Amino acid sequence: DDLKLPRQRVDLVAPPFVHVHEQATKQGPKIMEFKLVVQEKKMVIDEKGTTFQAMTFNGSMPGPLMVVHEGDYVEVTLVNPATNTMPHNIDFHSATGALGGGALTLINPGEQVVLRWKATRTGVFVYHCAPGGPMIPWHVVSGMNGAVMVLPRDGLNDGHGHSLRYDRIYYIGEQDLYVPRDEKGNFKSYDSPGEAYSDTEEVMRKLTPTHVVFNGKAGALTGKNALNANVGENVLIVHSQANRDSRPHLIGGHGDYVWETGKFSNAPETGLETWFIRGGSAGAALYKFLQPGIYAYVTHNLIEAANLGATAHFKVEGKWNDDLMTQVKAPADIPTGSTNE
Amino acid sequence: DDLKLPRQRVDLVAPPFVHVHEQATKQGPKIMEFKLVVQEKKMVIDEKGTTFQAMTFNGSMPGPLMVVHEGDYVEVTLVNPATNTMPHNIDFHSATGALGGGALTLINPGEQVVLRWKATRTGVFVYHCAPGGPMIPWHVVSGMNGAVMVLPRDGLNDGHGHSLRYDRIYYIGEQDLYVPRDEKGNFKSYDSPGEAYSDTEEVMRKLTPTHVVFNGKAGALTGKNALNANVGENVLIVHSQANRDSRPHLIGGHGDYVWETGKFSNAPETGLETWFIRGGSAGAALYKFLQPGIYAYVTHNLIEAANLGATAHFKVEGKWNDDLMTQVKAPADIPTGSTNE
Amino acid sequence: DDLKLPRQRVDLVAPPFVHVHEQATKQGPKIMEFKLVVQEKKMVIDEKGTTFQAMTFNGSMPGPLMVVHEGDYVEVTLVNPATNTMPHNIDFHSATGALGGGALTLINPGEQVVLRWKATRTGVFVYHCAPGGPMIPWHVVSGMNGAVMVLPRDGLNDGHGHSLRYDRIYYIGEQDLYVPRDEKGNFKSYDSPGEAYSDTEEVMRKLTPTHVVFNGKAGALTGKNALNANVGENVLIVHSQANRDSRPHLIGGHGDYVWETGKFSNAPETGLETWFIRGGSAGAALYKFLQPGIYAYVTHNLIEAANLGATAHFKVEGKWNDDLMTQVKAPADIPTGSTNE
Ligand SMILES: OC[C@H]1O[C@@](CO)(O[C@H]2O[C@H](CO)[C@@H](O)[C@H](O)[C@H]2O)[C@@H](O)[C@@H]1O
Ligand SMILES: OC[C@H]1O[C@@](CO)(O[C@H]2O[C@H](CO)[C@@H](O)[C@H](O)[C@H]2O)[C@@H](O)[C@@H]1O
Ligand SMILES: OC[C@H]1O[C@@](CO)(O[C@H]2O[C@H](CO)[C@@H](O)[C@H](O)[C@H]2O)[C@@H](O)[C@@H]1O
Ligand SMILES: OC[C@H]1O[C@@](CO)(O[C@H]2O[C@H](CO)[C@@H](O)[C@H](O)[C@H]2O)[C@@H](O)[C@@H]1O
Ligand SMILES: OC[C@H]1O[C@@](CO)(O[C@H]2O[C@H](CO)[C@@H](O)[C@H](O)[C@H]2O)[C@@H](O)[C@@H]1O
Ligand SMILES: OC[C@H]1O[C@@](CO)(O[C@H]2O[C@H](CO)[C@@H](O)[C@H](O)[C@H]2O)[C@@H](O)[C@@H]1O
Ligand SMILES: O=N[O-]
Ligand SMILES: O=N[O-]
Ligand SMILES: O=N[O-]
Ligand SMILES: O=N[O-]
Ligand SMILES: O=N[O-]
Ligand SMILES: O=N[O-]
Ligand SMILES: O=N[O-]
Ligand SMILES: O=N[O-]
Ligand SMILES: O=N[O-]
Ligand SMILES: [Cu+2]
Ligand SMILES: [Cu+2]
Ligand SMILES: [Cu+2]
Ligand SMILES: [Cu+2]
Ligand SMILES: [Cu+2]
Ligand SMILES: [Cu+2]
């Protein structure tokens, strides 16, 4: 027992929600214990019911958000149940050495492993499966990716000596999918990941996804699963993309404070319209809602947003501010005396 | 009449030019009145005469640049003449609430609407049509996008307490187009936007444009329409892309001061070769010309620049500086005594 | 002889290595003399032996890294031997005027030219061939691109008044290739660049590379050609991409200090997971190795990394630090008493 620190078990929750944590803490470093269970399963990924052979951490795309503080140790038990067909591992971009932990975590079905990494670098970071060779992109684009947030012990700041505190946090994992089609253009179904591989790899090679989704499917965060907020709340939106670039935008809002490269040692940028998540990274945006109503959160390639699945909704309760925006005149017939050339 | 401020009507001009404005102002906030008239029309988009069914604000791709100051109110009359076939609206990324104004501006042919938004955020911002669902990307990639610049009341600064002033401003709107082809590879023509939709959507879904153009067509800002400047002038180049990333570069020059995310609350970066406009944003670069001659302004995917339409020219008058660059020896035969392995 | 400065001849070396230079210097400005010889040749670009008709500076993809200091003059002799078939030139993104020098350097086979440019802007910069029109992207994606680094005379700094010094430097040139295929999907071979052009241009137009390689071929910097380092060394990794975006990541490491836009007048960002090289630029990352072993350096589109060629290896000698990372329990059977739902 070389490392003599208190241990705290964390119970992960499904995205887009985040497990209970403190922003600022005066507790000393701890060993933060997490469990991730690989689950291969067929999943529905669009509003027409298209299925595909997914591979997940903890049954979700993305995998759950892990939250720790700078100087904590993160002890992760990775479990690969014998119902799975493939070997799996885990690479933490937050971690130092052994390909992020991938070189120390390769497990066959029926096995588990325990990795410990010190949280020396602050920010939001991707984690993903990376078995080796062509299996690396396949496992990642099959769903095996999530994120971890390493907070400064004093919480977030604006890079100019002022504390920032969020009232709410959501984790938006964006997933690029490569679903094979038949000669007529219909999506193909398979009985196992292995059976889907060869056809999937051919789609992957042309670098054009068939779907780009938040929280694992088109429409996942719309309708009854819209994200809630209230006028005045400061909301942190963590966005990850393990394989492909994204350009997040909150329609009707802004990024008040944005860490587009995702690392809290760097001052955020202010007042952004659209920000950029480089493939293989996580970023974070804070926004204080000023108006009630529906907001769309998109990647601002609008073809991907509207036609390939990459739109979420916020439903924000409160009172409308006519000073910031008003409909001066409702739609009305163009006046007869108008000249509109 | 709740809002008791002076009103000023602005007459928009066609890009790449910009309407008359002040950089720094000591005037107080005003209500700045703008009119945008939707025009659906067939337009020529390449040097071989390819046409396509465009949808525009004020008859241009991009729509005109609107320029106001922080704290002004922007009162926009959007007009959809009865000669048009589709409903249209407007989303200002500069604005707060109601999906940028889209939720308050949906008008059928024969209607107009008046929206007012407070200019609380400084920078250059996209505006675009966003009717709903799949119509959002279609209207945007059909040409319905422009930009607005919200200047600080004191004008631009270098983020380190020094004023920056431009001698000239140009607005470069970049447009990704998705023109259908027949089985032989020739571009298809249609009699209406509605007729073009189904085939266009199929091209859009594969996320590869057929054309990438500045000011609405290949060659628009070359030849007799090159952009003018003079040695010593500080030129602001505003660049927008409503749907797709771009990587601007001034061949033979630099970005002296670049706001790649486009927001003046952030200090610019200095001395860039190439900068990055994330899809769904505007950015801005200042450059002081040091040499006369022709400059090419490109997106630095050179296939897009040279082969899909995305090159503009500057023609810069003045005297050559041999200290910065000189041809020491003109092309000459390789000397006989040379060894060139 | 207007310009009365000392002259120093530099002998270039093949990437990923870099010619001998000083980081900080107290020498005054000099005329730094470089020679680049164009070589058109067939080259092997993947592990299955696929060939293609390359065009290079000095026989390598990328062309060699040139290193000078701010205020030096760079006198480049460009040679186009009569064994070549095409005209060639050179555009330095570091240079001011005449399209970066392209407008002063066009040479036919059998000719040479001498260009001098003043190194007024600090950073890493692309150089590339740019003959005119469609020949520009073709020559660049055929291999005619490299980089130059213009160091501050005091060496690198952290943007906060502290010197940074590298123990080692590597230059990683990333190349997007567009190799034609026959109706069965096999790569086509040609006897000359001219013969390959028409088919290559058709691939280029669809903006999807067939290969994305470091140092000119899949596997170039893996196996016996892995990059060496030692625990404790600060390694500068210069990354260029003349045509297409990249997202570098050091698997198991970080970017301690990253200039993603590549320009040393801007403070670096700290502690990045993944950074972004915009097409038509160079960037640079410093990392101090903390753990021994194999590291993969990738573009973090993992399909491109694992399946299209874009992976390099570092082999790092030293002692493992169990505090930063440890395997707490090796892979073992899932305990009978476990519940893993
Ligand atoms: O800021 C640059 C810095 O990163 C360093 C910090 O000095 O270390 C990072 O990783 C180390 C792992 O132990 C820690 O010192 C540090 O707390 C963390 O940010 C150096 O390697 C370098 O100067
Ligand atoms: O996309 C090609 C072509 O395929 C068809 C079926 O023949 O539709 C498929 O592709 C659509 C777009 O991805 C999906 O909306 C649908 O689930 C799928 O069957 C055609 O309708 C389409 O033109
Ligand atoms: O700098 C962060 C800041 O944005 C705020 C300014 O305090 O507001 C922005 O939008 C508001 C709309 O009224 C204005 O206060 C402000 O002038 C503008 O930049 C906050 O919501 C937050 O601190
Ligand atoms: O691009 C496919 C194929 O189509 C042809 C006509 O058969 O040319 C078309 O496409 C060209 C590239 O976009 C355009 O230059 C031209 O306007 C268009 O007819 C072929 O020439 C080409 O191989
Ligand atoms: O920092 C902005 C600055 O770039 C300037 C420097 O004043 O010049 C750059 O190019 C010039 C070429 O002579 C040099 O003055 C300078 O050393 C270099 O960084 C201006 O044109 C402008 O303020
Ligand atoms: O990629 C299309 C198709 O072509 C084949 C040969 O018919 O393989 C070629 O393409 C592969 C992927 O790029 C390469 O691995 C190989 O060198 C090449 O012959 C098929 O195997 C493949 O499905
Ligand atoms: O140690 N107190 O939270
Ligand atoms: O299945 N993912 O939220
Ligand atoms: O672990 N690879 O399928
Ligand atoms: O109020 N004067 O410009
Ligand atoms: O048609 N646009 O400039
Ligand atoms: O308004 N949509 O076509
Ligand atoms: O001038 N001395 O290095
Ligand atoms: O051939 N290039 O390293
Ligand atoms: O110089 N062009 O082939
Ligand atoms: Cu896996
Ligand atoms: Cu990774
Ligand atoms: Cu419209
Ligand atoms: Cu938008
Ligand atoms: Cu060339
Ligand atoms: Cu260039």
Side-chain angles (χ1 to χ4, degrees), chain C residues 38 55 57 87-89 129-131 139 144:
Chain C
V38 180
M55 300 194 298
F57 297 108
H88 300 285
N89 68 345
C129 186
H139 284 232
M144 298 201 67

Side-chain angles (χ1 to χ4, degrees), chain B residues 247 252 254 256 260 269-271 273-274 300-302 307 323-329 331-332 334 339-340, chain C residues 35 73 93 97 104 110-114 116 118 121 124 126 205 242-243 245 261 263 265-266 278 280 282:
Chain B
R247 60 213 58 70
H254 297 93
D256 284 340
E260 67 168 31
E269 289 174 272
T270 55
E273 70 189 303
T274 301
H300 214 293
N301 183 315
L302 303 168
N307 295 350
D323 187 57
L324 287 175
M325 183 181 286
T326 198
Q327 190 190 65
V328 175
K329 302 280 163 40
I334 295 165
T339 292
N340 298 287
Chain C
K35 191 186 175 181
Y73 295 80
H93 288 188
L104 295 174
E111 292 189 318
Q112 64 186 42
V113 63
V114 184
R116 183 164 68 216
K118 196 178 185 177
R121 307 284 183 154
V124 289
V126 165
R205 182 165 294 281
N243 192 61
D245 304 326
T261 51
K263 309 296 167 288
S265 53
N266 303 287
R278 61 228 65 218

Side-chain angles (χ1 to χ4, degrees), chain B residues 26-38:
Chain B
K26 295 283 219 162
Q27 294 187 57
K30 294 192 181 194
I31 297 162
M32 301 299 294
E33 314 160 321
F34 295 91
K35 191 186 175 181
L36 291 174
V37 182
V38 180

Side-chain angles (χ1 to χ4, degrees), chain C residues 16-18 21 23 65 67 123-124 148-152 155-157 164-172 227-229 233-239 250 254-259 262 264 268 275 283-289 297 314:
Chain C
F17 305 100
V18 181
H21 59 286
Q23 290 178 60
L65 189 71
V67 183
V124 289
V148 54
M149 182 164 67
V150 180
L151 284 166
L156 300 179
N157 70 63
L164 298 176
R165 185 172 191 282
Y166 52 88
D167 293 273
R168 195 184 303 268
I169 179 176
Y170 296 115
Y171 174 37
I172 304 311
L227 304 177
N228 294 306
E233 289 178 343
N234 208 17
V235 178
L236 186 70
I237 308 166
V238 177
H239 198 119
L250 181 65
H254 297 93
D256 284 340
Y257 301 95
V258 184
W259 297 262
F264 301 141
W275 42 109
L286 283 165
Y287 183 63
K288 184 182 173 181
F289 283 103
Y297 181 84
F314 288 80

Side-chain angles (χ1 to χ4, degrees), chain B residues 2-3 5-183 185-341:
Chain B
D2 292 58
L3 186 63
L5 291 178
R7 277 163 178 281
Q8 180 182 332
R9 201 185 95 265
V10 180
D11 294 323
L12 289 162
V13 310
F17 305 100
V18 181
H19 68 83
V20 284
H21 59 286
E22 293 182 291
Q23 290 178 60
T25 187
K26 295 283 219 162
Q27 294 187 57
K30 294 192 181 194
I31 297 162
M32 301 299 294
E33 314 160 321
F34 295 91
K35 191 186 175 181
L36 291 174
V37 182
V38 180
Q39 183 181 29
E40 301 169 11
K41 50 173 171 177
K42 202 176 270 200
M43 298 181 79
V44 173
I45 50 68
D46 74 24
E47 293 193 283
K48 297 192 190 174
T50 304
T51 64
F52 109 137
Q53 289 294 338
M55 300 194 298
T56 71
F57 297 108
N58 268 21
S60 57
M61 279 190 283
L65 189 71
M66 296 160 53
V67 183
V68 301
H69 296 83
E70 188 178 4
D72 286 341
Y73 295 80
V74 184
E75 194 166 287
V76 184
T77 301
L78 184 68
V79 184
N80 189 5
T83 52
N84 290 324
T85 63
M86 305 287 157
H88 300 285
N89 68 345
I90 192 164
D91 170 356
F92 286 91
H93 288 188
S94 51
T96 302
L99 301 175
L104 295 174
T105 55
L106 186 69
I107 49 173
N108 293 319
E111 292 189 318
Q112 64 186 42
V113 63
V114 184
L115 173 75
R116 183 164 68 216
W117 57 268
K118 196 178 185 177
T120 55
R121 307 284 183 154
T122 63
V124 289
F125 299 85
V126 165
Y127 68 76
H128 66 85
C129 186
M135 298 298 91
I136 300 172
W138 181 49
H139 284 232
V140 173
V141 305
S142 297
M144 298 201 67
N145 62 87
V148 54
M149 182 164 67
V150 180
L151 284 166
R153 276 198 191 272
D154 293 338
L156 300 179
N157 70 63
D158 73 347
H160 300 278
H162 314 111
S163 296
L164 298 176
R165 185 172 191 282
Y166 52 88
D167 293 273
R168 195 184 303 268
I169 179 176
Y170 296 115
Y171 174 37
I172 304 311
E174 177 179 328
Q175 185 65 58
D176 47 321
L177 300 171
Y178 301 85
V179 185
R181 286 174 177 100
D182 71 13
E183 260 161 42
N186 303 302
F187 293 120
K188 293 182 75 183
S189 311
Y190 303 90
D191 290 331
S192 68
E195 289 165 284
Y197 176 63
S198 180
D199 291 349
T200 298
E201 185 280 337
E202 291 176 0
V203 183
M204 289 160 65
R205 182 165 294 281
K206 300 187 142 188
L207 310 179
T208 304
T210 58
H211 300 80
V212 181
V213 300
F214 301 146
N215 215 59
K217 66 175 297 180
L221 303 181
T222 67
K224 70 178 279 302
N225 276 336
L227 304 177
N228 294 306
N230 295 288
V231 171
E233 289 178 343
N234 208 17
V235 178
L236 186 70
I237 308 166
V238 177
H239 198 119
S240 75
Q241 227 301 4
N243 192 61
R244 185 176 180 268
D245 304 326
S246 183
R247 60 213 58 70
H249 174 90
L250 181 65
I251 305 179
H254 297 93
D256 284 340
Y257 301 95
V258 184
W259 297 262
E260 67 168 31
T261 51
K263 309 296 167 288
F264 301 141
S265 53
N266 303 287
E269 289 174 272
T270 55
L272 301 195
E273 70 189 303
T274 301
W275 42 109
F276 188 73
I277 309 297
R278 61 228 65 218
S281 76
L286 283 165
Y287 183 63
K288 184 182 173 181
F289 283 103
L290 302 176
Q291 296 279 38
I294 294 165
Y295 293 69
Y297 181 84
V298 298
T299 182
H300 214 293
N301 183 315
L302 303 168
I303 304 165
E304 293 186 29
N307 295 350
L308 278 77
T311 296
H313 289 168
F314 288 80
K315 290 179 181 167
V316 182
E317 290 194 324
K319 277 176 184 170
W320 180 262
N321 179 351
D322 278 306
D323 187 57
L324 287 175
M325 183 181 286
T326 198
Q327 190 190 65
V328 175
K329 302 280 163 40
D333 288 352
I334 295 165
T336 327
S338 287
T339 292
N340 298 287
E341 311 141 345

Side-chain angles (χ1 to χ4, degrees), chain C residues 20 70 73 80 163 283 288 341:
Chain C
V20 284
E70 188 178 4
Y73 295 80
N80 189 5
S163 296
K288 184 182 173 181
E341 311 141 345

Side-chain angles (χ1 to χ4, degrees), chain A residues 202 205, chain C residues 48 50 181 185-187:
Chain A
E202 291 176 0
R205 182 165 294 281
Chain C
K48 297 192 190 174
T50 304
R181 286 174 177 100
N186 303 302
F187 293 120

